[PDB]
Design an enzyme around this catalytic site. Structure first.
Site, mmCIF file in Angstrom:
data_model
loop_
_atom_site.group_PDB
_atom_site.id
_atom_site.type_symbol
_atom_site.label_atom_id
_atom_site.label_comp_id
_atom_site.label_asym_id
_atom_site.label_seq_id
_atom_site.Cartn_x
_atom_site.Cartn_y
_atom_site.Cartn_z
ATOM 1 N N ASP A 43 11.428 34.116 31.686
ATOM 2 C CA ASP A 43 11.136 34.389 30.087
ATOM 3 C C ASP A 43 11.180 35.984 30.377
ATOM 4 O O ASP A 43 11.069 36.711 31.371
ATOM 5 C CB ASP A 43 10.066 33.943 29.697
HETATM 6 C C1 LIG Z 1 -7.946 43.624 24.595
HETATM 7 C C2 LIG Z 1 -7.049 44.145 23.031
HETATM 8 C C3 LIG Z 1 -6.744 42.867 22.185
HETATM 9 C C4 LIG Z 1 -5.279 42.849 21.706
HETATM 10 C C5 LIG Z 1 -4.978 41.843 20.644
HETATM 11 C C6 LIG Z 1 -3.505 41.287 20.835
HETATM 12 C C7 LIG Z 1 -2.833 40.161 20.000
HETATM 13 C C8 LIG Z 1 -2.227 38.956 20.534
HETATM 14 C C9 LIG Z 1 -1.667 37.742 19.553
HETATM 15 C C10 LIG Z 1 -0.314 38.206 18.891
HETATM 16 C C11 LIG Z 1 0.555 36.807 18.482
HETATM 17 C C12 LIG Z 1 1.810 36.985 18.772
HETATM 18 O O1 LIG Z 1 2.460 36.159 19.529
HETATM 19 S S1 LIG Z 1 2.978 38.090 17.603
HETATM 20 C C13 LIG Z 1 4.302 37.019 16.722
HETATM 21 C C14 LIG Z 1 5.808 38.063 16.540
HETATM 22 N N1 LIG Z 1 6.764 37.037 16.244
HETATM 23 C C15 LIG Z 1 7.536 36.300 17.455
HETATM 24 O O2 LIG Z 1 7.119 36.314 18.343
HETATM 25 C C16 LIG Z 1 8.834 35.605 16.834
HETATM 26 C C17 LIG Z 1 9.761 35.469 18.082
HETATM 27 N N2 LIG Z 1 9.437 35.875 19.403
HETATM 28 C C18 LIG Z 1 10.221 36.634 20.266
HETATM 29 O O3 LIG Z 1 11.210 37.293 19.712
HETATM 30 C C19 LIG Z 1 9.428 37.433 21.715
HETATM 31 O O4 LIG Z 1 10.535 38.276 22.027
HETATM 32 C C20 LIG Z 1 9.488 36.241 22.679
HETATM 33 C C21 LIG Z 1 10.285 35.030 22.215
HETATM 34 C C22 LIG Z 1 7.958 35.568 22.749
HETATM 35 C C23 LIG Z 1 10.289 36.540 24.083
HETATM 36 O O5 LIG Z 1 11.105 37.206 24.045
HETATM 37 P P1 LIG Z 1 12.345 37.499 25.272
HETATM 38 O O6 LIG Z 1 12.616 36.173 25.578
HETATM 39 O O7 LIG Z 1 13.447 38.437 24.824
HETATM 40 O O8 LIG Z 1 11.488 38.102 26.382
#
Ligand SMILES: CCCCCCCCCCCC(=O)SCCNC(=O)CCNC(=O)[C@H](O)C(C)(C)COP(=O)(O)O
Ligand SMILES: CCCCCCCCCCCCCCCCCC(=O)OC[C@H](COP(=O)([O-])OCC(O)COP(=O)([O-])OC[C@@H](COC(=O)CCCCCCCCCCCCCCCCC)OC(=O)CCCCCCCCCCCCCCCCC)OC(=O)CCCCCCCCCCCCCCCCC
Ligand SMILES: CCCCCCCCCCCCCCCCCC(=O)OC[C@H](COP(=O)([O-])OCC(O)COP(=O)([O-])OC[C@@H](COC(=O)CCCCCCCCCCCCCCCCC)OC(=O)CCCCCCCCCCCCCCCCC)OC(=O)CCCCCCCCCCCCCCCCC
Ligand SMILES: CCCCCCCCCCCCCCCCC[C@@H](O)O[C@H](CO[C@H](O)CCCCCCCCCCCCCCC)COP(=O)(O)OCC[N+](C)(C)C
Ligand SMILES: CCCCCCCCCCCCCCCCC[C@@H](O)O[C@H](CO[C@H](O)CCCCCCCCCCCCCCC)COP(=O)(O)OCC[N+](C)(C)C
Ligand SMILES: CCCCCCCC/C=C/CCCCCCCC(=O)OC[C@H](COP(=O)(O)OCCN)OC(=O)CCCCCCC/C=C/CCCCCCCC
Lengths: 88, 70, 56, 459, 178, 107
Positions: A43
């Site tokens: 990935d």
């Molecule tokens: C310590 C400090 C705290 C920080 C807080 C952080 C909060 C974390 C929680 C956020 C929730 C989420 O996932 S945020 C939700 C955002 N939307 C999506 O993820 C839809 C499609 N996903 C993608 O396109 C990605 O790229 C992916 C497929 C994963 C890989 O891609 P590759 O295949 O190109 O590597």
């Protein structure tokens, strides 16, 4: 300092070491030019974790723009050699 | 190890030349002056205060202590 | 070579000539302010056996 | 006194009869010899003065200024030798002639037993400076700068001539010695108030005062290096010398009269030191620092106490040398970069280490680091002001801090950091420039060994 | 740093950058290795839950909301590598980085030492003089009309050609010149 | 618009000339090496050798025309005399009051 003058052989050896301790990849199937997306079925998150491991291994962190377009161990070694000004 | 690499740095020849020239001229004049001052102090200097004799009037340069000042 | 370096180095002599001329002019101008010589209350002095003026 | 004046006059035929490629060598050597001759005047008495004749006298306020004026000419010649290289022999000879005439006018100005002679020479110094600024200037605003410099001075000084002739008509003499011995109090009258203003404003404009300081940035930025040197080192001190000479007649009117000026200077030093923080120009920054220092000198003269006068004399000498050095450094940068803006050429310590050392020493001596004579004058004036009023120190405190800031700012913007990648015409510093900086800086560190030599007649 | 930037950042670039920042800040929070590994795997698992989501509006809702959470718990004093733009040795050796053209100003007595270096430098100067003249034409012909759209340079395409605008990229002083 | 777009016939702005290129050891004084070297020598000798050294020595050994040791000896002798007499050091009045004639008020 007293830092040994690391070379391309040492860089590539340490890269392959870190990649073989990555249990998501079986060690006997990977190679120097083996791709990450297709040749190993990893990935993009796995690739950025590989970048994490590289940064924690060599003591310096790669900018995100350059890191996100690094897909082979060979080109990673080439980039890090360019950064560290490695002769041989 | 024979890994001696070349160090790129600006030319320090002119700065060293200027410093050497300035030191050379300053010493060229100061060393004789210092030697002369030391000889004057050791041999001739340090007059001591006295009383004006009656009927004698001193000259203007006879009211000073250091021989070079006189 | 004399009579040749002079035509090129003659200019150097001018500043020192000006200095000695200025010293002479200063003494000459001094000569005109002797109205109170050996007459100040602070320095009335009796002339030496072979002295004519206290200062020149 | 003619033993100094006559060689200075002889400098002109020597220059004009010089071989086409020996003018600089002849001029520098004879200027240094004349400077050596000027050193004799330093041996002052605790008594009245060195009255050479009816026309010229010497004083331990006049002697340091005369020595500095004589010493400045070889430095100006060495600084001007660079940018006048592609110039015809006649015009170089004219430039040297103008510098010699400026020195002669200043020398006659500083002795000047009589006030009308002092005024005549004080305004005679104006023509060579104006011609130097408006002729051998690079930018197109040199004409406007020359107009400003001429007209500020003349607007200030025209009432001074009327006041002087009136004073001679009433008193009967304009001689300094007669005026000092026959000084009488001035009644607090409107006519006396305007006479005080006419006597003071002419010297106030040349310091210059915070209200009237506009001409100075223009004149300093647009003048060549020799012009900037002579403006910052000697021409600004003419106002202070004139005030110290003319203030004797003014009392007891000065106390009431001094408040507008004291407030203007105490706030203007802060204003100009703060202006220095946000500047895009080296020359303007140095000019504003000069304005701040001369505002402090104005405060010292207006307080009119012995410590004030000693501090003012020491600060004038120290500022002259320091500002001349700073302008020389800025010109060395400009002759390589041709931009005269700080933010363009950066990280010059990596490329020119010795020149960076010179920059550090100049910025430290502008910062008034002890035991330099800069801080000697600084501290004497500050103590006198504190005795005048315990609140002044607060303003003084701010000034000191702000001064240090911009000084190191000027040291950090141009010398530290990373060198601009594109500039490649930064050649190694020449022996001439290093000698110029050494000859600027060594007299300060020699004078700090013998401060009494520059502390004035009230020592 | 080496590659040219893009006109924008895609959604996946943003989520990857957020993942990188969050994982680095969690490593800063979790000093010990086992605790960091456990919490990083927990965070990775949480992150992967919304991976197959197809709604773009929902996709916009995701991560940006997470960014606010990241900003709340961002460890005000994070770990920074020593040579990084926030590190304690970020620009330690920039004062030792002297340009190459300075060698053109050396005195001949200084150039008497190191003669082989200056001979190789002369060969480099010759190569640069020829290659730049070729590169001007190559870039003029290859550039799109109306000006370039992205600050990326094309490679060399002939045999004797060199990469356009190469002199100041190849001739960097060093990372640690002294 | 057949104008030449040139306002006037003008020489091109010349580039700066380096004194180091045509002459190493150029001292920044003159383009002629002999005049260069001699100008450097005369400046160094008449500035650092003559003025800064001999002049500083001359200023250092200037005679006491300010009368500082004279004043110290005068004060020493004066205090020696006053302590012995029992006189109270320095008097408050700079001038003797007997020779000052005040104006009588009679108010
Ligand atoms: C310590 C400090 C705290 C920080 C807080 C952080 C909060 C974390 C929680 C956020 C929730 C989420 O996932 S945020 C939700 C955002 N939307 C999506 O993820 C839809 C499609 N996903 C993608 O396109 C990605 O790229 C992916 C497929 C994963 C890989 O891609 P590759 O295949 O190109 O590597
Ligand atoms: C950048 C550079 C810029 C330079 C610009 C040009 C220079 C400008 C300044 C020049 C001014 C010169 C000047 O004014 O001189 C002043 C002054 C002049 O003295 P003076 O007033 O004429 O004499 C006073 C008396 O009337 C006379 O006293 P006396 O006769 O009793 O004394 C003896 C005599 C001689 O005494 C001795 O020789 C002996 C003294 C020590 C004896 C010790 C014992 C030795 C014997 C024992 C061993 C051998 C025998 C036993 C052997 C067996 C052993 C087992 O004294 C001297 O000769 C002193 C010589 C001073 C030389 C000054 C040179 C100035 C040069 C100016 C130009 C410089 C240009 C740069 C280059 C300079 C050159 C490098 O000289 C000094 O300043 C000396 C300073 C000594 C300091 C002592 C330590 C003080 C430490 C304090 C600080 C503590 C905290 C740190
Ligand atoms: C301390 C005692 C010294 C006794 C030995 C005599 C020393 C004489 C030194 C005369 C000053 C040097 C000439 C001025 C310009 C520099 C000349 C030059 O081209 O150097 C190239 C030469 C070789 O350079 P390079 O390796 O080719 O070039 C490398 C790069 O350019 C990179 O260059 P860099 O980064 O290496 O820069 C050079 C170095 C040094 O270079 C400089 O910055 C020179 C200017 C430093 C002072 C700045 C003005 C501050 C006002 C002080 C006024 C003191 C006047 C005293 C009388 C002076 C008479 C001349 O940088 C510094 O160390 C900054 C020092 C800041 C000092 C802060 C504290 C000042 C007050 C200290 C107390 C003084 C009185 C004590 C009285 C009570 C106890 C007796 O380097 C030196 O010669 C360095 C000299 C050693 C540093 C002296 C610092 C203290 C001097 C204070 C004045 C003399 C006090 C005498 C009584 C002491 C007791
Ligand atoms: C612009 C940059 C700075 C330039 C230089 C500025 C400095 C010059 C300003 C001059 C300072 C004040 C001038 C006169 C001061 C006199 C004292 C007066 O202010 O106090 C009261 C005076 O009251 C009023 O001030 C009367 C005068 C009012 C008219 C003056 C105009 C006020 C503002 C104008 C400022 C413009 C200056 C610049 C002009 C171009 C005292 O009352 P009184 O006991 O009765 O008078 C005592 C004086 N006697 C004894 C001679 C009679
Ligand atoms: C490069 C690294 C260092 C190498 C060198 C190491 C040696 C360091 C020594 C240098 C300074 C260290 C301090 C040592 C001081 C000793 C000398 C000092 O004592 O002499 C001073 C003497 O110095 C002079 O007084 C000051 C110098 C004069 C300055 C005039 C400037 C020169 C003219 C140039 C043109 C002027 C331009 C500016 C116009 C104003 C003070 O003398 P003073 O205590 O009093 O009495 C002397 C004895 N008497 C009583 C017999 C008279
Ligand atoms: C900015 C500078 C400060 C300016 C402050 C005031 C500005 C407003 C004044 C404008 C000009 C006014 C012109 C007329 C003023 C009249 C003053 C006057 O006549 O006093 C003269 C007075 C007494 O007159 P008598 O009749 O002879 O006495 C017999 C009876 N007692 O005698 C004198 O002192 C003569 C001295 C000349 C006065 C100076 C006049 C000009 C104003 C003073 C200078 C202030 C302005 C300086 C300009 C600054 C530009 C840098």
């Amino acid at each position: 300092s007293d830092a040994p003058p690391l070379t391309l052989e040492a860089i590539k050896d340490r890269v392959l070491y870190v990649l073989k301790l990555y249990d998501k990849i079986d060690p006997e199937k990977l190679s120097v030019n083996s791709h990450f997306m297709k040749d190993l079925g990893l990935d993009s998150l796995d690739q950025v974790e590989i970048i994490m491991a590289m940064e924690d291994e060599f003591g310096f962190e790669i900018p995100d723009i350059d890191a996100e377009k690094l897909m082979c161990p060979q080109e990673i070694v080439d980039y890090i050699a360019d950064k560290k000004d490695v002769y041989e | 190890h024979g890994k001696r690499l070349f160090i790129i740095k600006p030319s320090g020849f002119y700065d060293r030349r200027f410093l050497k020239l300035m030191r050379f001229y300053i010493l060229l004049t100061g060393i004789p002056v210092a030697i002369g001052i030391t000889l004057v102090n050791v041999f001739i200097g340090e007059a001591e205060l006295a009383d004006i004799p009656e009927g004698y009037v001193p000259e203007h340069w006879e009211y000073f202590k250091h021989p070079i000042s006189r | 070579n004399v009579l040749q370096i002079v035509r090129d180095h003659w200019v150097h002599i001018l500043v020192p000539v000006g200095f000695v001329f200025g010293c002479y002019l200063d003494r000459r101008s001094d000569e005109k302010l002797t109205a109170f010589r050996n007459k100040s209350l602070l320095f009335k002095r009796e002339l030496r056996p072979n002295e004519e003026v206290t200062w020149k | 006194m003619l033993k100094i004046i006559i060689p200075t006059t002889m400098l002109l035929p020597m220059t004009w009869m010089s071989k086409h490629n020996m003018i600089w060598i002849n001029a520098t050597v004879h200027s240094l010899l004349i400077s050596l001759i000027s050193l004799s005047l330093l041996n002052q008495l605790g008594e009245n003065s060195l009255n050479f004749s009816l026309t010229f006298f010497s004083d331990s306020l006049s002697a340091p200024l005369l020595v500095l004026t004589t010493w400045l000419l070889p430095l100006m010649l060495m600084a001007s030798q660079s940018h006048l290289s592609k110039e015809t022999t006649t015009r170089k000879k004219l430039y040297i002639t103008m510098l010699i005439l400026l020195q002669l006018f200043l020398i006659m100005t500083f002795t000047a037993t009589e006030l009308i002679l002092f005024y005549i020479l004080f305004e005679a110094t104006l023509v060579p400076t104006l011609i130097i600024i408006t002729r051998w200037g690079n930018q197109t605003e040199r004409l406007n700068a020359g107009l400003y410099f001429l007209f500020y001075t003349l607007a200030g000084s025209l009432p001074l001539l009327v006041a002087l002739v009136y004073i001679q008509n009433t008193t009967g003499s304009l001689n300094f010695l007669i005026i000092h011995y026959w000084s009488h109090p001035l009644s607090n009258s409107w006519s006396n108030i305007f006479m005080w203003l006419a006597c003071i404003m002419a010297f106030m404009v040349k310091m210059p005062l915070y209200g009237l300081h506009l001409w100075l940035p223009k004149a300093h930025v647009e003048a060549p290096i020799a012009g900037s040197m002579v403006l910052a080192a000697v021409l600004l001190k003419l106002g202070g010398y004139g005030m110290m000479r003319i203030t004797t007649i003014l009392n007891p009117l000065t106390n009431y009269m001094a408040y507008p000026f004291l407030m203007l200077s105490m706030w203007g030093m802060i204003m100009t030191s703060s202006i220095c923080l946000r500047q895009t120009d080296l020359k303007s920054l140095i000019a504003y620092s000069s304005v701040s220092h001369m505002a402090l000198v104005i405060v010292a003269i207006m307080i009119q106490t012995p410590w004030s006068f000693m501090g003012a004399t020491a600060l004038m000498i120290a500022h002259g040398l320091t500002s001349s050095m700073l302008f020389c450094l800025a010109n060395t940068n400009y002759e390589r970069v041709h931009s005269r803006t700080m933010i363009l050429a950066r990280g010059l310590q990596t490329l020119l280490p010795l020149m960076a050392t010179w920059w550090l020493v100049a910025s430290l001596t502008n910062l008034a680091l002890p035991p330099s004579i800069n801080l000697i004058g600084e501290l004497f004036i500050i103590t006198a002001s504190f005795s005048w009023s315990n609140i002044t120190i607060i303003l003084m405190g701010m000034n000191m801090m702000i001064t240090a800031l911009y000084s190191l700012y000027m040291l950090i913007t141009t010398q530290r950091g990373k060198y601009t990648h594109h500039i490649n015409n930064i050649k190694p510093s020449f022996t001439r420039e290093n000698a110029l900086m050494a000859l600027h800086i060594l007299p300060l560190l020699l004078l700090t060994l013998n401060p009494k030599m520059i502390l004035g007649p009230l020592y | 740093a080496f590659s040219a930037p893009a006109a924008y950042l895609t959604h996946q670039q943003k989520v990857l950058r957020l993942y990188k920042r969050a994982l680095r800040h969690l490593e800063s929070w979790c000093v010990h290795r086992d605790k960091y590994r456990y919490f990083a795997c927990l965070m990775r698992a949480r992150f992967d839950e919304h991976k197959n989501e197809k709604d773009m509006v929902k996709a916009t809702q995701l991560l940006r909301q997470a960014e606010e959470e990241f900003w709340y718990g961002q460890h005000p004093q994070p770990y920074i590598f020593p040579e990084s733009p926030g590190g304690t040795s970020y620009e330690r050796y920039e004062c030792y980085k002297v340009p190459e053209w300075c060698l053109d100003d050396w005195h001949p007595s200084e150039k008497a030492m190191y003669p082989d270096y200056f001979a190789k430098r002369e060969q480099w100067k010759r190569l640069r003089r020829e290659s730049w003249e070729r590169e001007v034409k190559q870039l003029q012909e290859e550039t799109p009309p109306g000006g370039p759209r992205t600050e990326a340079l094309p490679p060399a395409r002939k045999e004797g050609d060199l990469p356009p605008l190469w002199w100041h990229i190849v001739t960097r002083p060093r990372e640690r010149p002294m | 618009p057949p104008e030449p777009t040139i306002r006037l016939q003008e020489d091109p702005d010349p580039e700066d000339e380096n004194l180091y290129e045509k002459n190493p050891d150029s001292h920044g004084y003159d383009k002629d090496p002999i005049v260069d070297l001699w100008n450097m020598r005369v400046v160094f000798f008449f500035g650092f050798s003559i003025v800064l050294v001999l002049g500083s020595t001359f200023v250092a050994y200037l005679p006491d025309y300010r009368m500082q040791e004279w004043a110290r000896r005068e004060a020493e002798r004066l205090v020696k005399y006053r302590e012995a007499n029992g006189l109270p050091l320095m008097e408050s009045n700079c001038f003797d009051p007997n020779k000052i004639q005040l104006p009588e008020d009679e108010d």
